[PDB]
Amino acid sequence: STIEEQAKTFLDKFNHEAEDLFYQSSLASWNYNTNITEENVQNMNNAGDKWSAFLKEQSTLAQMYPLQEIQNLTVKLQLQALQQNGSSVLSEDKSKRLNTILNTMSTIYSTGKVCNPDNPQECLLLEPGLNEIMANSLDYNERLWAWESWRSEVGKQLRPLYEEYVVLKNEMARANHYEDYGDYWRGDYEVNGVDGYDYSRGQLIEDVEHTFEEIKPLYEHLHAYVRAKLMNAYPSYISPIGCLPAHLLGDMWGRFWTNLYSLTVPFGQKPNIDVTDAMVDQAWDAQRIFKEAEKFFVSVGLPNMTQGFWENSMLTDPGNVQKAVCHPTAWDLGKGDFRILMCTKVTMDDFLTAHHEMGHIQYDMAYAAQPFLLRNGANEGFHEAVGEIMSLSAATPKHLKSIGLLSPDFQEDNETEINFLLKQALTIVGTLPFTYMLEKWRWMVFKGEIPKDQWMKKWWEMKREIVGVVEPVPHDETYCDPASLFHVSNDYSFIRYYTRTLYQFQFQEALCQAAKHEGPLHKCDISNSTEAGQKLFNMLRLGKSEPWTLALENVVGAKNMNVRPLLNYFEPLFTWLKDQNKNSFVGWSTDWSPYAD
Numbered sequence: 001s002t003i004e005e006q007a008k009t010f011l012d013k014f015n016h017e018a019e020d021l022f023y024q025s026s027l028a029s030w031n032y033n034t035n036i037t038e039e040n041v042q043n044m045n046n047a048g049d050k051w052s053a054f055l056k057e058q059s060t061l062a063q064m065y066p067l068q069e070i071q072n073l074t075v076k077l078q079l080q081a082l083q084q085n086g087s088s089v090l091s092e093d094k095s096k097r098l099n100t101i102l103n104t105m106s107t108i109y110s111t112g113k114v115c116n117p118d119n120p121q122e123c124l125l126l127e128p129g130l131n132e133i134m135a136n137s138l139d140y141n142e143r144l145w146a147w148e149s150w151r152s153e154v155g156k157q158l159r160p161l162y163e164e165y166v167v168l169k170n171e172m173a174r175a176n177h178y179e180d181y182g183d184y185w186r187g188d189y190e191v192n193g194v195d196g197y198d199y200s201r202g203q204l205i206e207d208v209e210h211t212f213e214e215i216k217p218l219y220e221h222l223h224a225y226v227r228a229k230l231m232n233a234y235p236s237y238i239s240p241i242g243c244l245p246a247h248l249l250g251d252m253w254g255r256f257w258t259n260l261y262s263l264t265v266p267f268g269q270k271p272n273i274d275v276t277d278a279m280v281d282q283a284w285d286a287q288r289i290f291k292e293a294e295k296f297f298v299s300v301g302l303p304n305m306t307q308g309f310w311e312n313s314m315l316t317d318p319g320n321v322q323k324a325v326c327h328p329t330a331w332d333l334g335k336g337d338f339r340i341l342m343c344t345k346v347t348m349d350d351f352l353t354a355h356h357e358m359g360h361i362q363y364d365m366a367y368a369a370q371p372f373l374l375r376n377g378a379n380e381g382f383h384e385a386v387g388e389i390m391s392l393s394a395a396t397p398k399h400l401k402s403i404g405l406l407s408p409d410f411q412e413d414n415e416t417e418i419n420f421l422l423k424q425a426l427t428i429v430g431t432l433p434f435t436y437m438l439e440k441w442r443w444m445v446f447k448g449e450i451p452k453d454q455w456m457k458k459w460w461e462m463k464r465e466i467v468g469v470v471e472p473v474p475h476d477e478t479y480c481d482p483a484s485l486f487h488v489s490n491d492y493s494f495i496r497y498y499t500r501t502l503y504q505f506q507f508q509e510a511l512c513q514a515a516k517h518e519g520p521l522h523k524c525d526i527s528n529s530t531e532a533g534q535k536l537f538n539m540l541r542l543g544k545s546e547p548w549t550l551a552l553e554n555v556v557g558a559k560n561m562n563v564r565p566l567l568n569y570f571e572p573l574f575t576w577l578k579d580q581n582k583n584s585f586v587g588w589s590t591d592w593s594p595y596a597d
Contacts, residue, residue, distance in 0.1 A: 004069050007062075011078055014058055015372040022372070023334035025051040030331060030339060034314050034324045036111070041103065049099075056088040073194070074545050078373040080192070089175045090168070098168040102491055105161050109489040110325045112157065116149030126150075126252070127317070127326045127343065134252050135259045140237050147247035148473055151481050158489060159480035163452060165491075170446055182443035185493045189379065191547040197559065199549060205443070208495060211502065211563045212436045218570060219429045221577050223468050224586040226257065226426075229264045241585045242592040243470045246463075249430070253485055254469050257430035258349060261423050266576075267415040271407070273397055274423055278405055279346045286316050286344035289351055292403060293358040296394065300526060301533030302362055308337045309361065317343040327486050328353050330360030330383075332375070338364055348395075355394050356387030363387075367543035377540070378548035381499030381561075386540055388504040389511065389526075395420070396525045412523075421522060421573035428501050429570075437466040439495045441482065453477035461590075470593040503552075505565035510556035511536060522569050 028047035032040040062082040070076040090098065114130060115123040122145070124130055133146045169181035178184050186201035230248055231238035238244045250259025261274055272278075290313075294305050318324050326343035333339060340357045344350050363377055363386050377383040393399070397416060400406035441459055444450065450458045456477045463469050475481060483489045512524040515532040526532045539555050549559050567574075 002069070003065060004071070004075075007065050007069070007075065007079065010061065010065075011075070011371070011373075014082070017054075018058075018372050019334055021051050021054060026331065026333035030333060033329070033341065034318065034322075036107075036323050036325070045099065045103070052086070052088050056086050058082060059084055059086055074374070077544070078371065081373045085176055087172055087176070090172045094168065094172075098165070098172070101161050101165045101168065105158055105165065105483065105489045108154065108157050108161075109483070109486065111323050112154050114146075114149045114153055116145060116153060118145045118148065122149070131252060134247065135250055138233065138263065140234060140248075143247035144245075144472060146252070147245075150252060150484055151475065151479060155480040155482075155484050156478060158483035159478060162480050162483050162489075166446065169491075170448070173446075180443075180446040180448070182439075182446040185439075185495075186443075188493070189548075191549055194547050194550070197547050197549045199547075199560075207561060208436065208498060211498075211561065212433070214563050215429070215432060215566070218425075218567070218574055218577075219433050220468075220586050221574070221581055222425055222429050223588075224581045224584050225577055226260055226264050228581070228584055229260075233263055237594075239594045241588070242594070243464060243468045243588045245472045245594065246469050247472075249469065253434075254467065255431060255434050255485070256349075257426040258423060261426055264422070264426070266418050266422050266580075270413070270415050270419060271410060273400070273406070273416060273419055274348050275400065275406065276347050279351075282405060284346055286342070286354075289344060289354050290315060290340075290342075290358065293355050293390075296355075296390070296527055297358065297362055297533075299528050299530075300536075301530035302537060303365075305358075305361070306336070306338060306365070309339070312337065313340045313342075315340065315342055315344060328357055330357045330364070330387075332364045334375075336368065352388075352391040352395065355391045356384070359383075359387035359390040363540045366537060366541040369541075370543045370545060374544040376544050378542070378544055378546075378551050379499070379503075380493065380496040381503050382540070382548060382551070384496060384500035385503035385507055386536070388500060389507050389536075392424075392504065392508055393524075393526045395424070396523055398523065399525050399527060402527070417522070417572060418576050421570055422577075424522075425570050425573055425577075428566075431497055432501060433467050435494045435498045437462055438482065438485070438488070439493070439498075440466075442488070442494070456481070464588075464593060464596070465590045468588045470595060472595050474595065499561060502561040502563060502566060505569060506552075506556045506558065506562055507536075509565040509568065520572075521565075522572075 025047040028040075028044045032044035059082055062079050065079060067076060067079060067083070070079070088095065110126075113123050113125060115121070130146055130150060134143060137143060166181075173179070173181040173184045176184065178187060183201065186204055189199065189201060189204050191197055191199040227238060227244050230244055231240070234248065238248070246254055250257055250263075298304050314324070317326060324343075325341070328343070329341040331339040331341065338361045340354075340361060342350070342354055342357060344354060360383055363383055367375060367377070397406060397410065397412055397420065401408055401410060441462060445455060454477070456475060456479055459482060460471060460475065486492070487494050508524070508526075509521060511526055511532050512521055514535055515524070515526050515529040517524040517526075535555070539551050542551050542554070552561075553559055
């Protein structure tokens, strides 16, 4: 018939061959990421390059097809996803150099060891060690050793590689008819030509700026509280009113403040709801954590997990004999198999991460019936949002008492709510400003507003004015501190997590309203609420077949990301936290630092 039916047949044979090729390439990537060797680097690289070449030739074959013939909007979405000139636009030599840079950075981050001379010989890894050191130690010099070591012995390696990566990705994106590579990352969030549902990328950065500006008060108050507590626990190292050093955040870079809970518990005379001790005293392992996640998903109405998931998942650390990337991940490999890469420890952070990854897997399992090009979540934000909906619904004291892991006689009082909310605020409201600042730096450095050396200066300055976190030792232009993070050195997008927080809070509000939970939202548990699970199932089975705004309004009834549910979560918190800092200076001066005197 006409070219429309020809395009339909094109899509059919594409989806078949692409299913096969994607399964093979995903297998190669998985075997690289769990069994890191050189043979696996070669296998992953050649499989990925072959798949990319096939995708680019199919993309040209689709570029033969004007989109003006489209009646079915789903078909338009599929061809538009196929209409890319793609990252393969670059020259083969240039593409190989870029891939070399990316791989070199990936291995330097995931395997490069710390050998610092401040403790004159000290060599360790990122996994238990540096992370555990920054998470469990309450002494200044040890934290300074860890921080300065990771920054001056690993960032200096990645400074030239990140420079080359920035240049190559920026020019490739300009070849792809984009302003920069941050433009590619933002244009991932595009919605085009759907009856008034359209969404640009400049509107996305404007929305992120607006939401951050609205958030800022709460994070400022939480900052002031945690700084007062640290100065109480660190006598002569946190100077009175200003910021505090970067190694004092219970995390390597200062992304999560949940560990500071141990130091910043508001009411310690109550039973601990951050139950790591309860888990270890209950003889808990990774498998039981994952199985309780499966039980939660069954009880919310979603079907039980696949046997192949149990058989083929890397549910624990493979060991120190092989250096597998231990940053938790969730994988589709196609054809009906699903995997989780979790180096699971017995800790609330790992329990919540396991729930997050199981939500990822359920999201992946629901839309598997869709065609290949739409076999992906409506956004990265939606995947992570589903995962942390599950995580938030788990953490309620009522749920903890449901499995009997929390004592059945445990009493729910005001101080328990304050403890719960302070922990949740530490986590979420410590990620938010850090992610916003980090991707602001990445966006504006890709766009080219910063001279190359000035990179470093600019970076630190913005932290001092956005995250309220400073350095104790000078770092000139020869360092590369941003690359010290996983996502920065693995070509990831970090605003994904900001959208994650906002989306998960809107979804939790709407889903608890659907579940008819009676009471405040922050104790709502959507377990045993099969109809709520059915609604969520509809949303995350929709897939990418419709614009993400449509699924947004399908669940909550909004056309955009909103900050209202998040502030409705931490309202009793905000009250208590304001009540405590009534006699404290909430805020930090930009030119004010224990180092930058």
